Structure formats: structure tokens, C-alpha cells
Amino acid sequence: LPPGWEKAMSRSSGRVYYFNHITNASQWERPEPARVRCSHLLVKHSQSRRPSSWRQEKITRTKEEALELINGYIQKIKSGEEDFESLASQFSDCSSAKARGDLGAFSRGQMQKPFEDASFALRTGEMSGPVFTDSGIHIILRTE
Ligand SMILES: CN(CCO)c1ccccn1
Ligand SMILES: CN(CCO)c1ccccn1
């Protein structure tokens, strides 16, 4: 299986699925360059390195509450009810919200390590599950 993937069993359905422990992605179907380009949606919490953003001068939500927000955004993106870029522009606690979450292209050794590892393990067009860094919890979309 591709880098980071394992088989798992659904508890509710009992059907086999696949999980990536580097990107925290999960899917039903059976699934390196110098640079990648990614967008992200960041939800900060009270233990972020800087608990403030353009949305909120004092970020007060707990880590648990931020993960619930991330999970809900992932649900709406996967259902097609909302687009990643729309949710990033509206709700990302990163200044890159103004650019639909786009961070541009980057190499290894620039970003926070868990973010970097998830970005390089995604395939082009693929999106992560919740990725935890010192900034908060991220949804990552690899665009190039
Ligand atoms: C302590 N809890 C709740 C118990 O499962 C957290 C904390 C951070 C993220 C998710 N759950
Ligand atoms: C990639 N960044 C900086 C990262 O915080 C952008 C992009 C567009 C607008 C503002 N910041």
C-alpha cells in the first residue's frame, strides 16, 4: 500500500476501509517531488502557539471544540455541501484565508513537521483529515 496506508474495519458497518496515519485521511477505496503546493483550513484553540487570529482577538475554544469544528468542515466538504475554498475563506484562523487557504509551494524543512509530512504524503488533489501542529488543527488540500 502507498506510504502511510493501512487496512481497517468499520465499527458501524463492518466493511473494510483504508486509513493513512500520516495524513489522517480515511476512505473506502484501496488507494517524491522537491516541492508541493497546498491550501489549508486552520482552526486554532486555546493551546495554539498564538491563540489569536484575524477572526478573533482572543481564541478561547478548547482543542476538543476545535476538532469538532474541523470534523464538521470535513463532513461538509466530502458531502459536496460546501467547498474547501469557501470554508477556508470564511473560517480559517490563518491569514491565508484571504487566498482561499493557499500557502503556495514549499519544500521539506519549511513548514511545521506534522504539516510537512501530511502535505508530502497526500497525492495531488487529495485532502487530509485533521492534522495537529502547534498552531492548531489543519485540513490540508494538496493542489500541486
Ligand atoms: C480530552 N478530549 C476528549 C476526550 O476524548 C479531547 C482532547 C482533544 C481532542 C479530542 N478530544
Ligand atoms: C501564505 N500566506 C501567509 C501564511 O500565513 C498568505 C497568503 C495570502 C494572504 C496572506 N497570507
Task: Give an account of the 3D structure.
The protein is built from 3 helices and 7 strands. With 144 residues, it is an alpha+beta fold. The chain folds into 2 domains: 1-31, Single Sheet (Ubiquitin Ligase Nedd4, Chain: W); 35-144, Chitinase A, domain 3, CATH 3.10.50.40. The protein has a 4-stranded antiparallel beta sheet with strand order 5-4-7-6, with helices on both faces. The chain has a 3-stranded antiparallel beta sheet with strand order 1-2-3, with no helix packed on it. Strand 1 (5-9) and strand 2 (16-20) form a beta hairpin. The protein is globular, with a radius of gyration of 15 Å. The structure holds 2-[methyl(pyridin-2-yl)amino]ethan-1-ol (2 copies). One 2-[methyl(pyridin-2-yl)amino]ethan-1-ol is lined by residues 63-64, 67.
* Shape by Cα distribution: globular
Estimate what percentage of residues fall within beta strands: 15-25%
- SS elements, strand count: 7
Element-by-element helix/strand order: EEEEHHEHEE
Q: Tell me the span between the first and last alpha carbons.
A: 22 Å
Helix content: 10-25%
CATH class of the largest domain: Alpha Beta
CATH topology heading of the largest domain: Chitinase A, domain 3
Supply Rg. 15 Å
PDB class: isomerase
Keywords: cis-trans isomerase, isomerase
Assembly: monomeric
Entry title: Crystal structure of the PIN1 and fragment 21 complex.
